[PDB]
Design an enzyme around this catalytic site. Structure first.
Site, PDB file in Angstrom:
ATOM      1  N   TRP B  13     -10.540 -72.016  40.188  1.00 49.92           N
ATOM      2  CA  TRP B  13     -11.076 -73.544  40.980  1.00 49.92           C
ATOM      3  C   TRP B  13     -12.289 -73.825  40.634  1.00 49.92           C
ATOM      4  O   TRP B  13     -12.764 -74.988  40.988  1.00 49.92           O
ATOM      5  CB  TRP B  13     -10.827 -72.663  42.191  1.00 49.92           C
ATOM      6  CG  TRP B  13     -10.858 -73.477  43.605  1.00 49.92           C
ATOM      7  CD1 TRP B  13     -11.161 -73.272  44.963  1.00 49.92           C
ATOM      8  CD2 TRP B  13      -9.927 -75.159  43.699  1.00 49.92           C
ATOM      9  NE1 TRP B  13     -10.399 -73.997  45.502  1.00 49.92           N
ATOM     10  CE2 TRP B  13      -9.937 -75.406  44.912  1.00 49.92           C
ATOM     11  CE3 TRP B  13      -9.732 -76.227  42.665  1.00 49.92           C
ATOM     12  CZ2 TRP B  13     -10.452 -76.418  45.481  1.00 49.92           C
ATOM     13  CZ3 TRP B  13      -9.547 -76.721  43.225  1.00 49.92           C
ATOM     14  CH2 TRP B  13      -9.524 -77.676  44.283  1.00 49.92           C
ATOM     15  N   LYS B 203      -1.666 -67.383  53.487  1.00 51.39           N
ATOM     16  CA  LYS B 203      -0.642 -68.055  53.121  1.00 51.39           C
ATOM     17  C   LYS B 203      -0.364 -67.616  51.375  1.00 51.39           C
ATOM     18  O   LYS B 203       0.373 -66.634  51.221  1.00 51.39           O
ATOM     19  CB  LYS B 203      -1.267 -70.021  52.492  1.00 51.39           C
ATOM     20  CG  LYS B 203      -2.323 -70.192  51.817  1.00 51.39           C
ATOM     21  CD  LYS B 203      -1.889 -69.842  50.237  1.00 51.39           C
ATOM     22  CE  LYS B 203      -3.370 -70.210  49.502  1.00 51.39           C
ATOM     23  NZ  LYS B 203      -3.704 -70.385  48.209  1.00 51.39           N
ATOM     24  N   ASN B 265      -0.939 -65.785  43.184  1.00 48.42           N
ATOM     25  CA  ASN B 265      -0.273 -64.341  43.872  1.00 48.42           C
ATOM     26  C   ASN B 265       1.789 -64.559  43.540  1.00 48.42           C
ATOM     27  O   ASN B 265       1.730 -63.371  43.165  1.00 48.42           O
ATOM     28  CB  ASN B 265       0.092 -64.633  45.147  1.00 48.42           C
ATOM     29  CG  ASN B 265      -1.566 -64.253  45.156  1.00 48.42           C
ATOM     30  OD1 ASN B 265      -1.964 -63.274  45.460  1.00 48.42           O
ATOM     31  ND2 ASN B 265      -2.350 -65.635  45.175  1.00 48.42           N
ATOM     32  N   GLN B 293      -5.817 -62.876  45.454  1.00 53.87           N
ATOM     33  CA  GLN B 293      -7.016 -62.440  46.448  1.00 53.87           C
ATOM     34  C   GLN B 293      -5.754 -61.922  47.604  1.00 53.87           C
ATOM     35  O   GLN B 293      -6.030 -62.088  48.770  1.00 53.87           O
ATOM     36  CB  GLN B 293      -7.120 -63.976  47.321  1.00 53.87           C
ATOM     37  CG  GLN B 293      -7.867 -64.846  45.966  1.00 53.87           C
ATOM     38  CD  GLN B 293      -9.480 -64.147  46.340  1.00 53.87           C
ATOM     39  OE1 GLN B 293     -10.624 -64.814  46.468  1.00 53.87           O
ATOM     40  NE2 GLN B 293      -9.626 -62.852  45.956  1.00 53.87           N
TER      41      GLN B 293
HETATM   42  N1  NAD Z   1      -7.493 -70.642  41.271  1.00 55.67           N
HETATM   43  C1  NAD Z   1      -6.720 -71.989  42.005  1.00 55.67           C
HETATM   44  O1  NAD Z   1      -6.023 -72.206  42.027  1.00 55.67           O
HETATM   45  C2  NAD Z   1      -7.574 -71.971  43.709  1.00 55.67           C
HETATM   46  C3  NAD Z   1      -7.067 -72.868  44.371  1.00 55.67           C
HETATM   47  C4  NAD Z   1      -7.907 -72.924  45.317  1.00 55.67           C
HETATM   48  C5  NAD Z   1      -8.472 -71.827  46.067  1.00 55.67           C
HETATM   49  N2  NAD Z   1      -8.908 -71.122  45.444  1.00 55.67           N
HETATM   50  C6  NAD Z   1      -9.884 -69.925  46.083  1.00 55.67           C
HETATM   51  O2  NAD Z   1     -10.844 -69.799  44.925  1.00 55.67           O
HETATM   52  C7  NAD Z   1     -11.350 -69.111  45.208  1.00 55.67           C
HETATM   53  C8  NAD Z   1     -12.362 -68.450  43.698  1.00 55.67           C
HETATM   54  O3  NAD Z   1     -11.029 -69.152  42.941  1.00 55.67           O
HETATM   55  P1  NAD Z   1     -10.847 -68.835  41.402  1.00 55.67           P
HETATM   56  O4  NAD Z   1      -9.798 -69.762  40.861  1.00 55.67           O
HETATM   57  O5  NAD Z   1     -12.374 -70.554  41.359  1.00 55.67           O
HETATM   58  O6  NAD Z   1     -11.845 -68.124  40.491  1.00 55.67           O
HETATM   59  P2  NAD Z   1     -10.903 -67.423  39.642  1.00 55.67           P
HETATM   60  O7  NAD Z   1      -9.702 -66.495  39.712  1.00 55.67           O
HETATM   61  O8  NAD Z   1      -9.997 -67.661  38.608  1.00 55.67           O
HETATM   62  O9  NAD Z   1     -11.319 -65.526  38.816  1.00 55.67           O
HETATM   63  C9  NAD Z   1     -12.483 -66.023  37.950  1.00 55.67           C
HETATM   64  C10 NAD Z   1     -14.129 -66.063  38.141  1.00 55.67           C
HETATM   65  O10 NAD Z   1     -14.035 -65.034  38.824  1.00 55.67           O
HETATM   66  C11 NAD Z   1     -15.368 -64.953  38.180  1.00 55.67           C
HETATM   67  N3  NAD Z   1     -16.304 -63.101  38.081  1.00 55.67           N
HETATM   68  C12 NAD Z   1     -15.313 -61.905  37.537  1.00 55.67           C
HETATM   69  N4  NAD Z   1     -16.089 -60.499  38.263  1.00 55.67           N
HETATM   70  C13 NAD Z   1     -16.968 -61.403  38.264  1.00 55.67           C
HETATM   71  C14 NAD Z   1     -18.334 -60.362  38.944  1.00 55.67           C
HETATM   72  N5  NAD Z   1     -18.104 -58.831  38.907  1.00 55.67           N
HETATM   73  N6  NAD Z   1     -19.134 -60.290  40.164  1.00 55.67           N
HETATM   74  C15 NAD Z   1     -19.056 -62.122  40.021  1.00 55.67           C
HETATM   75  N7  NAD Z   1     -17.832 -62.871  39.854  1.00 55.67           N
HETATM   76  C16 NAD Z   1     -17.114 -62.497  39.144  1.00 55.67           C
HETATM   77  C17 NAD Z   1     -16.120 -65.066  37.380  1.00 55.67           C
HETATM   78  O11 NAD Z   1     -17.279 -65.442  37.475  1.00 55.67           O
HETATM   79  C18 NAD Z   1     -15.142 -65.429  36.758  1.00 55.67           C
HETATM   80  O12 NAD Z   1     -15.437 -66.807  36.501  1.00 55.67           O
HETATM   81  C19 NAD Z   1     -10.992 -67.810  45.915  1.00 55.67           C
HETATM   82  O13 NAD Z   1     -10.549 -67.658  46.266  1.00 55.67           O
HETATM   83  C20 NAD Z   1      -9.866 -68.776  45.693  1.00 55.67           C
HETATM   84  O14 NAD Z   1      -8.459 -67.816  47.013  1.00 55.67           O
HETATM   85  C21 NAD Z   1      -8.054 -70.735  44.150  1.00 55.67           C
END
Ligand code: NAD
Ligand code: NAD
Ligand code: CA
Lengths: 344, 344
Positions: B13, B203, B265, B293
């Protein structure tokens, strides 16, 4: 103890027969003899009624499922219903007119009904709810059962829920005891018209969902179409339903849940995908993929355009009206997105 | 004066948001085109991910196949990344946000504002504590949220979708809308921040439940009932730990749908139900660094509900918790739905 008659023996009627038959055989307040009116058919040399009453399997419409032995197939509808305190109406909408003609005058004085028929009839306010058609013709108070309830899965006892719409509170509770099981869970709401109108309107939304699939879009887009559709179904119900209408009803299984399922799979979604990908007409697609049947989604949209014209409100329902115009005014199916994209 | 934007995070994201924000910031004068993105450094094939992003302009690990705007600049030190920012977009997995806020505390520009995209919860003296509250209290910035039906891969493909901005300040909300909105990424600003954020967090618990049922072979009726019953528990949770209308926004119904049909999930929960491998093992093997998450949110929810003495009122939430953490067999999940307060 109350007698039950299932009027209809198709896919859903037989699935319902499994649930009602099983509860009527266990619960003291219901007579265990549940009649089911079966339109007689010749199944390789044996009447379908005889098959049901000897094999306890509707081999044509619910093959692979045992029916409870206390469900009796009856080929004459008057004979099926004459004695019943509770009539469960579960036939295709096309046949309810004829069935009701045969039944008028022949029902017990305090008989009540519950309609399972998803769809919408015609009348003074443009549409007429099917349960009002049956109730007026036959003179009986009416309830409705609507939810996210594919019959094959119900027959398999896969967990699901449904909504009973019933004005009378003791009747709603009676009907809940009849139809609820550990895997078929019931919410009783005191509205009828709001529960019932979702069943028609959801197919309009599902045509729009199919257009989006046919244009290459995925889950995020379908989710927006369902969300905006639900908002248009709420607003439309508030315009069209006689009585008070609350948003909360639409979050029952009759509203949001049945909408989700229909938009992810079904005749209306499949045809509308095909319409957007092949450019073939709906009538052509009905013949090539539904064996000549009328798709209710496009027809309801056209009916909604007439109602909104009578009310002066066409411009307040862009998603409904975009389905209409793509199906019947030649608007290109790409412009359906332009409407999601310039929405409020 | 123009405002400088820092994206705090770079995942699936994070990177999709950098595509949107990078493009809008390069086309809109009120945002400096230079958008920094804090990227937690990783060795990939002998090379630094930050240097792959700044040379190749793509996050090859978490958003492969998409170019980031060249005005987006990956930055490994989070203080350096945020130092000059007026607008900070917080989008890291919820398990890391506490540590990042400790590294940033005291180093932000004087009137900086934040928006949280993080789908999770935390705990505090009132029981529930929103993550936006954690960030805002710890950094001393005002906080907004962005939550909606937003699978990152589809947003990155410019497939049409919606989202909800929660913001108490209408001028700030309009500015964030301008920063985020595209013709295929439509934004509604609402003032009920807490409810928007709760929807986003809870959710993902429902989606773990949804995945369990897919993996055991239940079909669409069961999925729709899980979605609907999850929504009822979400609404009951908001009423207690925070009005109906917010759930009709993208952050409510839409996100529940898109997630229970196509999220991470859901996909891991299905594999868990089919293979008996653990969530942790499946997360590592199937998501190539991305983070679940839902299960963690389910653990924190159980702890929150425990302290209000309300566990027994949320059986779906608690069923997900006990399968993931207390070894309840996934075959027993559905039994938790057969006596739900909605049907009592
Ligand atoms: N991926 C989706 O489709 C999506 C959509 C909407 C909201 N979200 C929400 O966005 C938020 C972030 O999700 P995402 O998709 O960008 O992440 P992600 O699930 O892709 O996880 C990858 C990230 O985790 C980081 N990471 C791993 N270990 C780490 C550490 N020790 N310290 C700091 N960072 C570390 C990495 O920098 C990497 O970029 C979440 O709450 C998610 O629920 C996700
Ligand atoms: N099948 C499902 O999964 C499902 C689920 C929920 C609601 N419904 C609704 O239930 C209603 C009926 O659905 P179904 O699955 O039983 O359809 P079906 O096509 O399987 O029904 C077979 C029906 O054909 C009727 N029939 C055929 N020819 C007839 C004739 N000349 N005269 C009178 N009746 C004739 C029979 O009475 C029999 O009941 C529909 O309105 C549908 O909206 C269906
Ligand atoms: Ca936490």
């Amino acid at each position: 103890s109350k007698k039950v008659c299932i009027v209809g023996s198709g896919n859903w009627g037989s699935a319902i027969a499994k649930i009602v038959g099983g509860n009527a055989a266990q619960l003291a307040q219901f007579d265990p003899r549940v009649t089911m009116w079966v339109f007689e058919e010749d199944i390789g040399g044996k009447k379908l009624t005889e098959i049901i009453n000897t094999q306890h399997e509707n081999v044509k419409y619910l093959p692979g499922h045992k029916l409870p032995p206390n469900v009796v197939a009856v080929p004459d509808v008057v004979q099926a219903a004459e004695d019943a305190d509770i009539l469960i109406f579960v036939v295709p909408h096309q046949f309810i007119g004829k069935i009701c003609d045969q039944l008028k005058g022949h029902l017990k004085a305090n008989a009540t009904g519950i309609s399972l028929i998803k769809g919408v009839d015609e009348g003074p306010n443009g549409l007429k709810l099917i349960s009002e058609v049956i109730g007026e013709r036959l003179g009986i108070p009416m309830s409705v059962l609507m939810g996210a309830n594919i019959a094959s899965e119900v027959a398999d006892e896969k967990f699901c829920e449904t909504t009973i719409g019933c004005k009378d509170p003791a009747q709603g509770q009676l009907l809940k005891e009849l139809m609820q099981t550990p895997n078929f869970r019931i919410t009783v709401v005191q509205e009828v018209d709001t529960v019932e109108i979702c069943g028609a309107l959801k197919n309009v939304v599902a045509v729009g969902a199919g257009f989006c699939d046919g244009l290459g879009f995925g889950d995020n887009t379908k989710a927006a179409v369902i969300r905006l559709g639900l908002m248009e179904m709420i607003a439309f119900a508030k315009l069209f339903c006689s009585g008070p209408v609350s948003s909360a009803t639409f979050l029952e299984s009759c509203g949001v849940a049945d909408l989700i399922t229909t938009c992810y799979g079904g005749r209306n979604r499949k045809v509308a995908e095909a319409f957007a990908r092949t450019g073939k007409s709906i009538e052509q697609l009905e013949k090539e993929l539904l064996n000549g049947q009328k798709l209710q989604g496009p027809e309801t949209a056209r009916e909604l355009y007439s109602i909104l014209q009578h009310k002066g409100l066409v411009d307040k329902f862009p998603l409904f009206m975009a389905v209409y115009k793509v199906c019947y005014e030649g608007q290109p199916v790409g412009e359906f997105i332009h409407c999601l994209q310039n929405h409020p």
